[PDB]
Coordinates of C-alpha atoms and ligand atoms in Angstrom, one line a residue:
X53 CA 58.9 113.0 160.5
X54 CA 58.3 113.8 164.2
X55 CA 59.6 110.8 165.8
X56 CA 62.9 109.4 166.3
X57 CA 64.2 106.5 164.3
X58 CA 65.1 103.1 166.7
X59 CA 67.5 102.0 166.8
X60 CA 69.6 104.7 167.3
X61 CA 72.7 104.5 166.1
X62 CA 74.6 101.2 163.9
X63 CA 75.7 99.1 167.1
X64 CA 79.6 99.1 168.4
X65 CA 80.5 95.9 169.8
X66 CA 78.6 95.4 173.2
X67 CA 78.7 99.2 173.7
X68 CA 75.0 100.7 174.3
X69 CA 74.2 104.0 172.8
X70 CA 74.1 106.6 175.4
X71 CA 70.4 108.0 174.6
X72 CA 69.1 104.8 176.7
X73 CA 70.8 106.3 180.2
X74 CA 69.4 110.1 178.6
X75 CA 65.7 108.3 178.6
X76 CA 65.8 106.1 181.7
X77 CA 65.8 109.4 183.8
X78 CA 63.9 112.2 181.8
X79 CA 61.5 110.0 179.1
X80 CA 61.6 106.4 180.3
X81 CA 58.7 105.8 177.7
X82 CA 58.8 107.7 174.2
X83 CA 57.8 107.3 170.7
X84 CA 60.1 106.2 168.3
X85 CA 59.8 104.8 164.5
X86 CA 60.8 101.4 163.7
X87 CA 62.6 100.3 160.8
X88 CA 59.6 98.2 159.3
X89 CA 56.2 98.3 159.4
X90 CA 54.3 101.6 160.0
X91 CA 53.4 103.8 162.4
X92 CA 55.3 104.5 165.5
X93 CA 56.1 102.5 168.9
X94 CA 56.3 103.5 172.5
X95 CA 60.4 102.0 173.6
X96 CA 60.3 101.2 177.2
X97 CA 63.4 101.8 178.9
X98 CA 63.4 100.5 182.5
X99 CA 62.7 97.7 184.5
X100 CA 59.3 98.1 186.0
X101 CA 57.6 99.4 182.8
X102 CA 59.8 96.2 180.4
X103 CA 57.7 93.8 183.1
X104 CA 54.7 95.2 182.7
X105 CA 54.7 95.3 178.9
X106 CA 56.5 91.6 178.9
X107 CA 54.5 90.3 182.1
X108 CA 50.8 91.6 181.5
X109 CA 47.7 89.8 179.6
X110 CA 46.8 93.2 178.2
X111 CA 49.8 93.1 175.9
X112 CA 49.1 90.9 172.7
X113 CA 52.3 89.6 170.4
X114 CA 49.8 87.7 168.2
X115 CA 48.3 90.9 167.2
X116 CA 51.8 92.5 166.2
X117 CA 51.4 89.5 163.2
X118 CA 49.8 92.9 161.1
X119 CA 52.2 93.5 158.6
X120 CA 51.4 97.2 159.1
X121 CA 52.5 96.8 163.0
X122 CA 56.3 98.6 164.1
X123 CA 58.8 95.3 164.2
X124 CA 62.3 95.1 164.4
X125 CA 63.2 93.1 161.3
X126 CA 62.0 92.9 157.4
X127 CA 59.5 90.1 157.3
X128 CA 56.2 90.4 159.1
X129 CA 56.3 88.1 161.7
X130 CA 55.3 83.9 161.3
X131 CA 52.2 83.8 163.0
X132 CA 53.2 79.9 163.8
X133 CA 56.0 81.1 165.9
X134 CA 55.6 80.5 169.5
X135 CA 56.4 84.8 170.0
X136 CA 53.1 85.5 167.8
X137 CA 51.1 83.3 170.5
X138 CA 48.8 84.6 173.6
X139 CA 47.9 82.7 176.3
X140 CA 46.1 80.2 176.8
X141 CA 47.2 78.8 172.8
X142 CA 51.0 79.9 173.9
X143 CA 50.9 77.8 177.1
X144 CA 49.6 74.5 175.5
X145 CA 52.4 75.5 172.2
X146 CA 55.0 75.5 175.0
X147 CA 53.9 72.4 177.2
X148 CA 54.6 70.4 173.8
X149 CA 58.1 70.6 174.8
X150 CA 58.6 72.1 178.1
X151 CA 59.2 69.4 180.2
X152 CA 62.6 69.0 178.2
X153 CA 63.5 72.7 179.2
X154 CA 62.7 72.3 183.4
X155 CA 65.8 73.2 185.4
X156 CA 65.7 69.6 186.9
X157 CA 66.0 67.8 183.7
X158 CA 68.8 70.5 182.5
X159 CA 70.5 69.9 185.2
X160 CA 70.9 66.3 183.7
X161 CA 72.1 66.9 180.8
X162 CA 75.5 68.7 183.2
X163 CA 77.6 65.2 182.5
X164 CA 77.5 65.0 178.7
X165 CA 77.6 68.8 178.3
X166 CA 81.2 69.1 180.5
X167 CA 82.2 66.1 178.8
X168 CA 81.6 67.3 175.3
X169 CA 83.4 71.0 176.5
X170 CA 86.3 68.9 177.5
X171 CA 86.8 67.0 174.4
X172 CA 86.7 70.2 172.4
X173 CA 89.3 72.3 174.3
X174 CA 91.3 68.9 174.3
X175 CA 91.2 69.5 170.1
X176 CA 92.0 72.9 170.8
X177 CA 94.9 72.2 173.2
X178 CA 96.3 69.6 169.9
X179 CA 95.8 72.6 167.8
X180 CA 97.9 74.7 169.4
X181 CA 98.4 78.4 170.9
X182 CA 96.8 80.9 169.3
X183 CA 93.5 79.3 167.9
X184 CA 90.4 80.6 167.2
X185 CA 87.7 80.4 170.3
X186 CA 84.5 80.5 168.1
X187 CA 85.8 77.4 165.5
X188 CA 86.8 75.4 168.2
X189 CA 84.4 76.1 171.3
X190 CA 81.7 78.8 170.7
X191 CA 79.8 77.3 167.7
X192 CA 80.6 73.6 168.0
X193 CA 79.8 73.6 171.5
X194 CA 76.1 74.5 171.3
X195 CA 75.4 72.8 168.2
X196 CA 76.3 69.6 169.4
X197 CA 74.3 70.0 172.7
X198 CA 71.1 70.9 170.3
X199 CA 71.7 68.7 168.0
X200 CA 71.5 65.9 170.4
X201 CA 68.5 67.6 172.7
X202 CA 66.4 67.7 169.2
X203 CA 67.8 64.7 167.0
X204 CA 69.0 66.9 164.6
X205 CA 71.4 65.3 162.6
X206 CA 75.3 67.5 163.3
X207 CA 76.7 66.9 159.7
X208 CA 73.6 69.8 158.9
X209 CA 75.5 72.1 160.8
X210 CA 76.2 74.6 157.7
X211 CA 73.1 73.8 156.4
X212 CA 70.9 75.0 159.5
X213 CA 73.2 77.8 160.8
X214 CA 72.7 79.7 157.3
X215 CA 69.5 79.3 157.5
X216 CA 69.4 80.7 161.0
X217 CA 71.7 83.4 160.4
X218 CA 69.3 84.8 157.7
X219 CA 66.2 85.1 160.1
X220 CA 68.5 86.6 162.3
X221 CA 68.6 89.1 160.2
X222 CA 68.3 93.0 161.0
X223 CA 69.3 94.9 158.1
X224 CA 71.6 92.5 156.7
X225 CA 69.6 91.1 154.3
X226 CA 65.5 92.0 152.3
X227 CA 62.3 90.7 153.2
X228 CA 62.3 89.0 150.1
X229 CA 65.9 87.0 150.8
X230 CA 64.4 86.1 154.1
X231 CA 60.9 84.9 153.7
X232 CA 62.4 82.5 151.1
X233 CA 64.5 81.2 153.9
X234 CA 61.7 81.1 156.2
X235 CA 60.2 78.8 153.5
X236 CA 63.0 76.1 153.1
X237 CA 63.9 76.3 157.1
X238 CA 60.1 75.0 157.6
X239 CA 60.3 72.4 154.5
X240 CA 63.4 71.4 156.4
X241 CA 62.0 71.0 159.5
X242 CA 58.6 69.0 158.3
X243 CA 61.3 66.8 157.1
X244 CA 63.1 65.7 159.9
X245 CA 59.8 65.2 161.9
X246 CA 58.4 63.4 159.2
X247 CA 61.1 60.7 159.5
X248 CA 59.5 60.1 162.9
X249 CA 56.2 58.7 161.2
X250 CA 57.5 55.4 161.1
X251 CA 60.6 55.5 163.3
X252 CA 59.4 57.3 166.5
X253 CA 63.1 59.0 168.1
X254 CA 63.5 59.8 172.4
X255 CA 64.1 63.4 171.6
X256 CA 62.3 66.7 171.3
X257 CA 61.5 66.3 167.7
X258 CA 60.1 63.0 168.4
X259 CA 57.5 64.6 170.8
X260 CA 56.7 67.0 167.8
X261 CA 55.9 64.4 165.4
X262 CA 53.7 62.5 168.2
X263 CA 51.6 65.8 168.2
X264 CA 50.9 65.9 164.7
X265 CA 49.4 62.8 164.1
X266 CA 47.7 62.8 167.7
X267 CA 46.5 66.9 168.9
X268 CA 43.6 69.3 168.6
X269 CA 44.5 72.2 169.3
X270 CA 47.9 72.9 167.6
X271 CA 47.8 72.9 164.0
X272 CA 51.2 71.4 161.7
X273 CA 52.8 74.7 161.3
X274 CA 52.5 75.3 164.9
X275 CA 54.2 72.2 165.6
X276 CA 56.8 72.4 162.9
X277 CA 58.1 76.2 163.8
X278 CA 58.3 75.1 167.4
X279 CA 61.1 73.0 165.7
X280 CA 62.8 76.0 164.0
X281 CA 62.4 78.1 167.0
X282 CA 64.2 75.5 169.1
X283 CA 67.4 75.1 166.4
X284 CA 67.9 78.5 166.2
X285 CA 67.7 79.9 169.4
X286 CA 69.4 77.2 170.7
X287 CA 72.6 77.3 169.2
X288 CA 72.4 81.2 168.0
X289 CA 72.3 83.0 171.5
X290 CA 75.1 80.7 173.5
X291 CA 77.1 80.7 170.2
X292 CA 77.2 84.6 170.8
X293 CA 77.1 84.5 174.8
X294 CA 79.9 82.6 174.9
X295 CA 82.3 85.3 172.9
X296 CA 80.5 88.3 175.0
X297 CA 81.0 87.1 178.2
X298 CA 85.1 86.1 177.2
X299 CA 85.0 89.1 175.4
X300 CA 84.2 91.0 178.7
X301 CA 86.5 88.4 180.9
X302 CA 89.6 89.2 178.5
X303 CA 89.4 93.2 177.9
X304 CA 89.7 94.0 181.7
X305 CA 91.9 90.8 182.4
X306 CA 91.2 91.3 186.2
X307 CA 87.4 89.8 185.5
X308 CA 89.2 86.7 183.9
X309 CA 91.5 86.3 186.9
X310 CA 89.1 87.1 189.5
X311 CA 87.3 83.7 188.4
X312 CA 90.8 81.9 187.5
X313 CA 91.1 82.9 191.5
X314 CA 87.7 81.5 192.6
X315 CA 85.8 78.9 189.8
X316 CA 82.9 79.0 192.1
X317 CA 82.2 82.5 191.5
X318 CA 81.4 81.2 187.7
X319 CA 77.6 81.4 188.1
X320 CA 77.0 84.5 189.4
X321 CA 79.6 86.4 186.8
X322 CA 77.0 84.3 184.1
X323 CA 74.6 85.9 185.7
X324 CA 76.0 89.6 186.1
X325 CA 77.2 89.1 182.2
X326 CA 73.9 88.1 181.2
X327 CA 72.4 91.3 183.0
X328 CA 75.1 93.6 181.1
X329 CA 75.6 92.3 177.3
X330 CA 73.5 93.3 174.8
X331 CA 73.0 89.5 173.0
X332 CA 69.6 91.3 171.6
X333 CA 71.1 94.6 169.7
X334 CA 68.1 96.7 170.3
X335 CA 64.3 96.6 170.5
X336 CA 62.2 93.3 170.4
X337 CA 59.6 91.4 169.6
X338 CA 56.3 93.8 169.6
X339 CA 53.1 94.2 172.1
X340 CA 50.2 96.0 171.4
X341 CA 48.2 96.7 174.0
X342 CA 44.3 95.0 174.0
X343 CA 43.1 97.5 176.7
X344 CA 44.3 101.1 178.0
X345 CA 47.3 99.8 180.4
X346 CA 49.3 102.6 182.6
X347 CA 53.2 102.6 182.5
X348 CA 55.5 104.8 185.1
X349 CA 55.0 107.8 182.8
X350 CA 52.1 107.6 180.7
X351 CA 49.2 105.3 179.7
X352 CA 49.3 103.3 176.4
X353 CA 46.0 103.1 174.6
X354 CA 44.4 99.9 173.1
X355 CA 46.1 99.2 169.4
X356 CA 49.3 100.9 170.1
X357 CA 52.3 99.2 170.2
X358 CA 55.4 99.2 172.8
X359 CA 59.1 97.3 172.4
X360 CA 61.5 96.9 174.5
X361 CA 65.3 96.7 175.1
X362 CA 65.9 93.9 177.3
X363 CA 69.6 95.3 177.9
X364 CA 68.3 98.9 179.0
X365 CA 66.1 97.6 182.1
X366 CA 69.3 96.0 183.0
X367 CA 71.0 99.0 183.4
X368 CA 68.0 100.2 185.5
X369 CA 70.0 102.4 188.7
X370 CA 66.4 101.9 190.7
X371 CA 67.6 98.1 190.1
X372 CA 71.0 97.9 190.4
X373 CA 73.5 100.2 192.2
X374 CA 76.5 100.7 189.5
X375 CA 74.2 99.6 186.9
X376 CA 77.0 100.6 184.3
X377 CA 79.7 98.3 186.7
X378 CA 80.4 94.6 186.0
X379 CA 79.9 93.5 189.6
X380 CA 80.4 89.1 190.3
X381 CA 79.6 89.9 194.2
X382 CA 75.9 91.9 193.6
X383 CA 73.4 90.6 196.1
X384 CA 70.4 91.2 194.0
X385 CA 70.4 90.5 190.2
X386 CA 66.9 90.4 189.2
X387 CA 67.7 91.0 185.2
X388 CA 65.7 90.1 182.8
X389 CA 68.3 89.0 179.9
X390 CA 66.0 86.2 179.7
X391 CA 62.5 88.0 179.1
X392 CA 59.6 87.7 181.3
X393 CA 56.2 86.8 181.1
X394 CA 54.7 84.0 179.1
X395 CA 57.1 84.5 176.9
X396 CA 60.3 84.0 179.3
X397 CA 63.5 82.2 177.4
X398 CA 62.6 78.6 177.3
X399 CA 66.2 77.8 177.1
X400 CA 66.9 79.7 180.2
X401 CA 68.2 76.5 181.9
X402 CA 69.9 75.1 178.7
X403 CA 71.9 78.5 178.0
X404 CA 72.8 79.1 181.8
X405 CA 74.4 75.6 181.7
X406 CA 76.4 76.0 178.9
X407 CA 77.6 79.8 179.7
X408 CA 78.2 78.1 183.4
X409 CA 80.7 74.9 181.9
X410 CA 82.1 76.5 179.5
X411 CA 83.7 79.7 181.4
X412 CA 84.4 76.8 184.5
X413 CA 86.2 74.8 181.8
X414 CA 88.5 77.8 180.6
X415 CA 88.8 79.7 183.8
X416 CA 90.0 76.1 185.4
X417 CA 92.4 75.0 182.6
X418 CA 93.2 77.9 180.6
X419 CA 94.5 80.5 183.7
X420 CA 97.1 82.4 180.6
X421 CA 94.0 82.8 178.2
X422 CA 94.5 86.0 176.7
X423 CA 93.2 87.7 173.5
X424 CA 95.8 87.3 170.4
X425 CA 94.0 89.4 167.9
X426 CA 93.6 93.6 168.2
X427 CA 90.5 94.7 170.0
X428 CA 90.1 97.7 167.2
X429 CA 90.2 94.5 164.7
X430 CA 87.4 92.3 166.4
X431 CA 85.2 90.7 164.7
X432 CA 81.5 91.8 165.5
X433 CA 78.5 90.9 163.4
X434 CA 76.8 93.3 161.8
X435 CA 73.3 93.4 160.4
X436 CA 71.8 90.6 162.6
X437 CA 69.0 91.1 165.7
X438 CA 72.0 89.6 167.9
X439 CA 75.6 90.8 168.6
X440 CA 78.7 88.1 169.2
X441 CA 82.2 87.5 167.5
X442 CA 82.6 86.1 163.9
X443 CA 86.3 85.3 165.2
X444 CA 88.1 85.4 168.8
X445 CA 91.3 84.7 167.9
X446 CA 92.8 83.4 172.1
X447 CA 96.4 82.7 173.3
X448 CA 97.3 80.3 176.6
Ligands
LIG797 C1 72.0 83.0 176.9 C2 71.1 82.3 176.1 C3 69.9 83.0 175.8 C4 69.4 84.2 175.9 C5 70.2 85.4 176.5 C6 68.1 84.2 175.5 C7 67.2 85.3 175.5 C8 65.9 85.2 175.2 C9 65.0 86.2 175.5 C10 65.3 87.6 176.0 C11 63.7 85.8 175.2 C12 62.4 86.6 175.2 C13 61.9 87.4 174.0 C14 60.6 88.1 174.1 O1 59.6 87.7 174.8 O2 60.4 89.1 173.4 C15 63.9 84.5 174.7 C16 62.9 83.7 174.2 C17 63.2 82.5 173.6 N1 64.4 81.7 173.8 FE1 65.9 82.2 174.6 N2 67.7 83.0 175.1 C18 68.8 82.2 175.3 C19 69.0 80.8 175.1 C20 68.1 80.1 174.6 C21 68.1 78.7 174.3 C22 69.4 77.8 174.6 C23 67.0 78.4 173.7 C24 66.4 77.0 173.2 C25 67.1 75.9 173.4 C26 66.2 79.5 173.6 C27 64.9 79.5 173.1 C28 64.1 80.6 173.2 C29 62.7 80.5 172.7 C30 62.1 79.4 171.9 C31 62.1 81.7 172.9 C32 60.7 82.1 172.6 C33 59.8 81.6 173.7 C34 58.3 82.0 173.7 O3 58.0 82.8 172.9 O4 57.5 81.5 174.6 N3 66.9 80.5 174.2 N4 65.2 84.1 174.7
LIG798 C1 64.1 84.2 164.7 C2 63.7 84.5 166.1 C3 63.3 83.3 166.9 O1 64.1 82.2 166.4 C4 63.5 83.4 168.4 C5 62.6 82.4 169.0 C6 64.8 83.2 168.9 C7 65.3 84.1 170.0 C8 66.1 83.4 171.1 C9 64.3 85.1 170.6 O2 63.3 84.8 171.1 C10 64.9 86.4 170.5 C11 65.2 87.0 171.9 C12 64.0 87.3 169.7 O3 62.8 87.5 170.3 C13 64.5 88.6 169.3 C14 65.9 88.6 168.8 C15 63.6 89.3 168.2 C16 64.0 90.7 168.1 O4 63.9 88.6 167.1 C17 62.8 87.9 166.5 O5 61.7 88.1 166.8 C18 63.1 86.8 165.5 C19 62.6 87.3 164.1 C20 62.6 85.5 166.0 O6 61.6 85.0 165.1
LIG799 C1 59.8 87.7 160.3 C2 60.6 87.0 161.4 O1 61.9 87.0 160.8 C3 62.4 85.8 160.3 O2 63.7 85.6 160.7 C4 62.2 84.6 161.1 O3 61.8 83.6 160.1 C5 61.2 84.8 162.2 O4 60.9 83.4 162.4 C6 60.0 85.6 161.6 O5 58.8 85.8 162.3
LIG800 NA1 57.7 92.1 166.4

């Protein structure tokens, strides 16, 4: 056809194809095709366009529910997911369980969470030198912490990361494969919040039951997805977070020693890691436009759809000087590794927390972590909507 195919190219571990730099300067906004669906898709490229199409009410995600509309990934979108809804339905899906998700009450939840790091590089340190990160800190870590935020019950730990691995899923596996998943992940879920019919529980999936039997405005499936949503994104991105950012920390050692040197820089190297790693491997969830709406370059007409790649504005040079630099003392780091918009993480808190305690907790204790496996070896998973390590294999 005319148009390029997107993605590009088969990802290489955090690595980002070099046509997004190309299109940043001289096409900022093109046309591409998209692996399912049909038609084409305007990518957006840079910062202040990726806001716009993200931050503005003229943009609908319910509408790219069409199973004819460009998307990333082999089913057609859930229209019960919380990413299908548009304001005002979105913000009272959201309030359901917000309040959990405010930075104040995250901030609470900083005790247990060190405590629960602790006791796991403590099983690590019986173990022994060399060990693998991911077994003993990057999955259990997170799972326990959303486990216990939802009331899910931890011995399901196989069970629900399957599951979540499959809707994960890029190219990896059919339509087919995954709407069946889709299927027994909801059947799952309506499960667990059944239990609370008689048995109310103080965690999120306690609030979800109270809104099925008393709310007017969100229907069951709604309600229930919200639960999915929550169990996957919750452990899936810090799972893979943390293995990026030690990943990055480990493969030019000086980043590992230059917070080994100063703990307290721990935040804003988060922060600056967030901005640079590619956690999403290309593209996103899908706006169409309801209205005409100009971007930098051109103006995008009603019923055509736009993606975007989160990690591209972050290497925006009108955004950040050495964009392509991992920098821990930038100024100004206004990335948007989290989204923006109504549809900004919900997790943001949650998943700077644990990136924040567990780098503190190895920078602190482990000074001699090295990797003890061949970079040209590593790991990476392939045919998911995410990138991390399926192993990282550390000495100390
Ligand atoms: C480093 C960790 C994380 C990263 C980098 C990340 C990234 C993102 C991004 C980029 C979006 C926006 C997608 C879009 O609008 O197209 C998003 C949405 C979302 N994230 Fe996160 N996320 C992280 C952690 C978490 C955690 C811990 C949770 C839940 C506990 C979570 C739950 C969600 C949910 C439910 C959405 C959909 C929100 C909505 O549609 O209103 N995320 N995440
Ligand atoms: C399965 C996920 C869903 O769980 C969301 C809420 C979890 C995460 C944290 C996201 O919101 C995530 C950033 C997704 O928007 C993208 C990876 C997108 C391309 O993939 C998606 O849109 C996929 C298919 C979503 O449905
Ligand atoms: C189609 C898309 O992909 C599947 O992984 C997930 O079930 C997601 O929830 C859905 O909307
Ligand atoms: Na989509």
């Amino acid at each position: 056809d005319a148009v390029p195919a997107y993605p590009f190219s088969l990802p290489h571990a955090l690595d980002l194809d070099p046509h997004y730099a190309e299109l940043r300067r001289d096409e900022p906004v093109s046309r591409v095709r998209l692996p399912y669906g049909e038609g084409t898709a305007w990518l957006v490229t840079r910062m202040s366009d990726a806001r716009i199409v993200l931050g503005d009410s003229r943009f609908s995600t319910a509408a790219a529910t069409d199973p004819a509309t460009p998307r990333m990934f082999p089913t057609p979108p859930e229209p019960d997911g919380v990413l299908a809804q548009d304001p005002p339905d979105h913000t009272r899906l959201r309030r359901l369980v917000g309040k959990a998700f405010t930075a104040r009450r995250v901030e609470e939840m900083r005790p247990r969470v060190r405590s629960l790091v602790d006791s796991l590089l403590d099983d690590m340190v019986a173990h022994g030198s060399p060990a693998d990160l991911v077994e003993f800190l990057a999955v259990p870590f997170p799972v326990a912490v959303i486990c216990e935020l939802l009331g899910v019950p931890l011995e399901d730990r196989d069970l629900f990361r399957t599951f979540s691995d499959a809707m994960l899923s890029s190219t990896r596996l059919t339509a087919a494969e995954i709407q069946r998943v889709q299927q027994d992940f909801m059947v799952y879920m309506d499960g667990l919040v059944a239990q609370r019919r008689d048995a109310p529980t103080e965690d999120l999936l306690g609030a979800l039951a109270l809104a099925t039997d008393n709310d007017d405005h969100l229907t069951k499936g709604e309600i229930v997805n919200m639960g999915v949503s929550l169990l996957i994104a919750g452990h899936e991105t810090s799972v893979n977070q943390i293995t990026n950012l030690v990943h990055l920390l480990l493969t030019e050692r000086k980043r590992y020693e230059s917070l080994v040197a100063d703990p307290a820089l721990v935040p804003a190297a988060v922060e600056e890691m967030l901005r640079y790693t590619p956690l999403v491997s290309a593209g996103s969830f899908v706006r169409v436009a309801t209205e005409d709406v100009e971007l930098s370059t051109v103006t995008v007409r009603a019923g055509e759809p736009c993606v975007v790649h989160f990690a591209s504005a972050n290497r925006d040079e009108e955004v950040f000087d050495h964009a392509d630099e991992l920098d821990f003392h930038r100024e100004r780091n206004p990335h948007i590794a989290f989204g923006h918009g109504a549809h900004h993480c919900i997790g943001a808190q949650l998943g700077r927390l644990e990136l924040q305690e567990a780098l503190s907790a190895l920078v602190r204790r482990f000074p001699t972590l090295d990797l003890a496996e061949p970079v040209a070896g590593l790991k990476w998973k392939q045919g998911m909507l995410i990138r991390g390590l399926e192993r990282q294999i550390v000495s100390w």
